[PDB]
Every structure is written in C-alpha cells, then in structure tokens.
Amino acid sequence: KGEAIRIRSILRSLIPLGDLVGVISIAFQMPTIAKDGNVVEPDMSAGF
C-alpha cells in the first residue's frame, strides 16, 4: 500500500537509524556493593 509505504518512509526520514543505535549503545549506571555491605541503589526516577 502506497500510503503505508509513504508513512514508513516519512518516519524513517524523521528518525535517523544511527541515533537509535547510539541511544541503545548508551549504558546504564550500575548498582554496586558498598564497604559496609549494603547495595547503593541509584535513584531511577532521576536517571537513565
């Protein structure tokens, strides 16, 4: 369908592939064991 093809092409023009790949390549910050033994958990509502 030409309409669907046009819409998909428009969305491809809107969003580059490399930007999506880079955002996927971005890595989260890591929970880590502290000296006392507890887990310091990054606040997720303020992070990636």
Add this chain to the structure above:
Amino acid sequence: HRTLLYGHAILLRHSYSGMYLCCLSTSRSSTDKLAFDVGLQEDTTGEACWWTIHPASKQRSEGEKVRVGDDLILVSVSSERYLH
C-alpha cells in the same frame, strides 16, 4: 483542455527543459534534516511529479474554481511536503 480545481493533483512540465517539477527525495538536509529538495525529473510516471493544490485564502474552498491570480499553496504527493 480541463478546468483546474482546488484540491486536485496537477503535473507541471518545465517549458524550456521539458522535464517535470517534483520532489527529489534526496536532500542536502542542512538545518532541516527532515525536508527534501525540489528539482526536475525526466519521467512522467511516479507520485513525485504530481502536486496537490490547496486554497491558501480562507474564502476559497475544496472543489472551487481556481482564480487567475489568487495566492496558492502546493503539497507534494510523494511526501505531503509543501513547496517551501
């Protein structure tokens, strides 16, 4: 010999070259990565050549007679982008 109407696709042939105005779909993309470029192509076939008329003025409406000297806005059939 047909009478032009608002909201009707039109195909333009350049007088000198004999080619047809269209959206190239290949863009220099400076400033606006989203927009395409506009240029001539030889082939008649394709949705790129055709452009849809729309009434810029509020008084004119879809299906109305086309004025001789009225302001006008054209939208590319291929990507729904105005001649900008």
